[PDB]
Design a protein around this ligand. Structure first.
Ligand SMILES: [Zn+2]
Lengths: 36, 49
């Protein structure tokens, strides 16, 4: 994996501290509210 | 004749009480029912609004 390579690659460079109805469309409705 | 024909009558009254029925303009509405009942209930004594 790319990530694994990148890791190994940097790990060698590391250092440490020393010791209803709608007339518009003609559709039929059922509620006055359903109309509005 | 009045309902579906071509008879139109002007009733001379002088003054008269009236009543209003508002309706939604964007929906069918046929006032025959009310105007029928009005005519139906006229009397040698009464006369509804
Ligand atoms: Zn519609």
């Amino acid at each position: 994996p790319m990530s694994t390579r990148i890791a190994e690659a940097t790990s060698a460079i590391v250092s440490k501290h020393p010791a209803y109805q709608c007339h518009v469309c003609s559709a039929v409705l059922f509620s006055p509210l359903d109309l509005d | 004749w009045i309902k579906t024909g071509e008879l139109r009558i002007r009733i001379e009254m002088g003054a008269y009480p009236y009543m209003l029925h508002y309706y939604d303009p964007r929906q069918y509405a046929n006032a025959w029912n009310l105007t029928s009942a009005w005519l139906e209930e006229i009397t040698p004594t009464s006369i509804p609004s």
